[PDB]
Amino acid sequence: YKCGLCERSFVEKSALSRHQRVHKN
Numbered sequence: 001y002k003c004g005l006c007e008r009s010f011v012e013k014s015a016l017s018r019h020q021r022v023h024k025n
């Protein structure tokens with residue numbers, strides 16, 4: 001799953017969700 005904001009490919013949506021801490025809109 002590509003973050004869109006930094007498109008790092010997170011294998012699982014859980015990780016993608018967690019990764020938003022990095023930007024959080």
Ligand SMILES: [Zn+2]
Nearest residue numbers: 003005006007
């Ligand atoms: Zn990101």
